[PDB]
Amino acid sequence: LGLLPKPEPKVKLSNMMSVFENDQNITDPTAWEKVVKDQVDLRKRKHLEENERRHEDAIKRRKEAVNMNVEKPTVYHCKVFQFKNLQNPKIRFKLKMNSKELSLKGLCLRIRDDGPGIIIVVGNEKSCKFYENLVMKRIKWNEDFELHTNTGDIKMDMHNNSISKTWEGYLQDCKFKGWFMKVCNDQDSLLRTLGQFDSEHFYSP
């Protein structure tokens, strides 16, 4: 119908010699090197372009994903963990990241500083499994670290510290709004903390 350009031949450094399309074949020898060599790269450049343009578009498209807002799951898988010490900061930090990274609702608590504590996490079942893997198999709680204090740096030996899971299960609703690490001095306000969430029972002496 003539809406569209008639296609010209593809040409390469193989096909180069025997294309006698009217354009400077033997006459200009190096002028026909450039045309084909330029021609080859222009095709490739297009491959590269389709890639980057598609790559970029999705990231904008990603932002719509960011905007999308949860839609409640009917059932909430959960876990619970219990340990002797949390003192190492590198451990304190991971637990804040991954919780925010994976959309895990929940909380964490413990006694004072060196006193033991508990961890709670809630989400879709895929999330928890990652986090569970982290807490047990990835992270080493028995490992030793040199902590920083207000004065300077000092060694700490946590070898006695250990972790083990208590329960995993299912709950009518997860009243935890966000994942909120905190500290309690006693064993009681610790309960009242969970108490707010009707979670007093999740702690085991």
Place this chain on the structure above:
Amino acid sequence: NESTADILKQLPHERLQAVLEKIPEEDLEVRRLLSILKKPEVVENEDVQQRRIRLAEILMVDEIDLENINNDFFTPATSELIFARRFLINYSLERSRKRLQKEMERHQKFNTRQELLSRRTELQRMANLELAGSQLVSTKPISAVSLSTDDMVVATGSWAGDLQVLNSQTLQPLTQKLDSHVGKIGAIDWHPDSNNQMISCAEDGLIKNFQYSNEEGGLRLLGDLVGHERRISDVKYHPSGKFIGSASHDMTWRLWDASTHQELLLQEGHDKGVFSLSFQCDGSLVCSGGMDSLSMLWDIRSGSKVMTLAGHSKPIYTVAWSPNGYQVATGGGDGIINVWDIRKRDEGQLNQILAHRNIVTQVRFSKEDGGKKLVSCGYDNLINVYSSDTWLKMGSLAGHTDKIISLDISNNSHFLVSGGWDRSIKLWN
């Protein structure tokens, strides 16, 4: 100019491509039309642009029009059963009165020191317990085990649904086996008095009243119970002694007499399976656990649904009543034990022990002592011990290599017998 546009318009690709732009663009908007149009909402792998095209491709072929045009009773009867309710009331009322009085009498002494010693001792005892032996039964996992009121004999039901009765202390080997007419055994229960009878429910929808003869292996069917279509999960003897209540799968728990083998009450009210029925020690009330996660109390005498309990977000397998009679305990697919004491009603209600991972099968209170300890079994392979006051978990015991279908505990509380997917029967100290 016309013939140029017509041939282009006549063409299938072009005909499609015109239609693609009139259809809304969102995942949800696109999706809704599909499900309404009945075609698969989603395919294997696709971005929404690919999804959208599918719409068009479907809209084109059928020549379908645009998304524009696209878009309680009281039942009477059974006087004879009516007679029984009177019996229950006379029996129930007296028993309740006696029970409450007895409970009150305990209160007066106080002398806390003795008690708080006692709990500590009990916990230590629980801490110690270990295996005695294993044993074997069959090659199907063991679905029910029960101890007689004298605690000398165990009955073990396989999935194969054959019951062999074993000797509590030693277990070795057994008395004698029978392969019952039924293939998959629900529950097995002893009559509270004579130690001459059992009862067993199973896959076939038939309950069998067994005569256990002396030291003989001549276990003798007394009678069969009919009326049940589906498999029957649980069966119990009223605390009284006269009546047997059956609870199966088709949303019918049926109250049955022992003697006449008749259907005294056909009850309805759950909307899926009903996986347990429990009778509470004054013989006043039955609480039904179900697959619909609704624990539903029932008054046998008025036949009135009383208090519905909501807490379990998966099916409720066992419903264990407490000896005191004012508390119940439930267990479920969700790995929780709820314990509801009816007296408080306004603001006490349910204390959740978080017990087990991976389900819960059978929760048991300790019979003697009015009920203090809880014992429960899930597929976690462990077995638990709980106080009835704090409901703090005290101790756990692992001797099973596999999962545990059910467990029963010695009346004194010097035995614990647990049976298991692994096909043994393990006596706990």
Place this chain on the structure above:
Amino acid sequence: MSAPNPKAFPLADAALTQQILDVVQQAANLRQLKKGANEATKTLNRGISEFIIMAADCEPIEILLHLPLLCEDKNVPYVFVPSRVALGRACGVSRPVIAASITTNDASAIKTQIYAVKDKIETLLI
């Protein structure tokens, strides 16, 4: 639906079926799957199976009801999924399929989806 067959048990729900059928197909592409009755019955006798999936509405149902009794002796989980037509697709087949047995390779890529689903299925067998 239609009346789900009373002999069908454990019956997977809607949410488990999506998780199961997805594993099926994910195994089909690594050819760790085996489709059909006889192919599945072969597996158990050898001892390589992981779990069996069956069609609930298989007409008549009695033709597969032998699998459950075989599975219980080899200690192998199993469940029914609500339609055969859906199970046909997941195995990569035009046409209806009533049973399928995922197999064992313990170097496999999908190993961790499988242990996931058996864990879910064994829960249903109460």
Place this chain on the structure above:
RNA sequence: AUCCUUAUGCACGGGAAAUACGCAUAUCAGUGAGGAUUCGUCCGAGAUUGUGUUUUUGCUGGUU
């Protein structure tokens, strides 16, 4: 955040084949197509039937 695996889609670059590729208001077909066997068992998806094109399909360029 990096990295890795499988499937599907568009695509640069490199090969092989067109006695090959399809189509059917049509028969069956994991509720077992079609094969192998050391005879103990072992593989598991297409086979019929009618048909279209197949030393070629579309498109340009030279020279007379």
Place this chain on the structure above:
RNA sequence: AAUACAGAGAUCAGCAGUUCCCCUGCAUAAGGAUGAACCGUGUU
């Protein structure tokens, strides 16, 4: 039938297109692995 005639009547070459197959990109789906020193109920 007699006659008039006119009277024996294109080749070299290129590219894409269907079909499988490998290499390399980006996307979409599911899946995994590992790393990131910090802890949200009376003067203007």
